[PDB]
Symmetry: C2
Subunit: 215 residues, 2 copies
């Protein structure tokens, strides 16, 4: 296990290779480790609140129940990372790679996921209230029972995503691509959808969700 003094001294010396390092429970609030290779690192329950991890490599890292509130993760590689129950509220994940990441039960309230890659990510039960996912790729993402209340999914790719059980009151889906997605009828009644791309079957479902009869 590497401690705070050690990792900050190494980083100060210009070292960036921290792959597979054990940093469980470490206290790194307001720390900057931009560009660090933390691939496969164990950061379980780490406190990384307001840390600057811009452009860090965190692929397949264990970030389960980590505190990443307000952290900068712009253009970070979080592919296949374990972020179950992590606190990412108000984090900047703009342009981050989160494909196939485990974000189950994560706190993403007011998170910035603009232009992020969330292809096949597992967001089941995640809280995305007030989050911004403009231009994000959610192709095939699992949004089962997620909270999307007041979330901005404008211009987002939701093709083949599963939004079963998602809360969508106040959700903003203008210009989103919904083709092939699985959604509850209530989505058609709650989301703003101007410019949203749909299949014919979905357009019919939109009409049915407003009480029209096709018999």
């Amino acid at each position: 296990h590497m401690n705070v003094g050690e990792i900050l001294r190494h980083y100060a010396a210009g070292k960036r290779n921290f792959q597979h390092i054990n940093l469980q429970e470490i206290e790194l609030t307001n720390a900057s480790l931009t560009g660090a290779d933390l691939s496969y690192a164990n950061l379980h329950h780490a406190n990384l609140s307001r840390a600057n991890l811009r452009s860090a490599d965190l692929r397949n890292a264990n970030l389960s129940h980590a505190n990443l509130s307000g952290a900068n993760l712009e253009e970070a590689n979080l592919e296949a990372a374990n972020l179950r129950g992590a606190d990412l509220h108000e984090a900047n994940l703009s342009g981050a790679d989160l494909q196939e990441a485990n974000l189950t039960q994560a706190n993403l309230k007011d998170a910035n996921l603009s232009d992020a890659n969330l292809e096949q990510a597992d967001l089941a039960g995640a809280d995305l209230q007030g989050a911004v996912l403009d231009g994000a790729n959610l192709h095939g993402a699992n949004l089962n029972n997620a909270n999307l209340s007041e979330a901005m999914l404008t211009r987002a790719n939701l093709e083949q995503a599963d939004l079963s059980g998602a809360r969508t009151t106040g959700a903003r889906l203008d210009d989103a691509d919904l083709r092939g997605a699985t959604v509850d009828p209530v989505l058609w009644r709650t989301a703003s959808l101007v410019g949203a791309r749909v299949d014919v079957d979905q357009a019919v479902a939109f009409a049915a969700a407003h009480g029209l009869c096709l018999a």
Copy 2:
């Protein structure tokens, strides 16, 4: 030309056959001629305000620019009648037969057309503001540029009707049959349509009218 005294005396004697009679411009306000056969009669610009014409036969009658405001025409036969520019505001036309009638530019404000037959009727430019057409048959009716603002067309048959240019702000079309009708996209944005029956193409048009893209 038969005058007021003559027709009322004849009716009082039990006469009901007034077919093809000339009654142009006659003043018959609050008169009762229930069950009278006035088929093919000339009632051009007659004043029949608040008259009781329940169950009258007025088939093919000339009622052009007649004042029928508040008149009772329940179960009256008005098939193919000329009612162009007639004033029928607040009239009771419940169960009347108006198929193929000319109602162009007619005033039907607050008229009761419940369960009336309006098959292939010409209602172009007619004013139906606040009218009640619950259960009416408007199969193939011409509603071009009609005013349907706040009109109740609940449970009405609108199959193959033409509503091009119709004003439909506040229109109430719950349970109406719209299949095959021609409508402007604005209808889908303005009418209440719970239970309204539509084709697949119409359901898609409903979605498109709310800004959804089918590309």
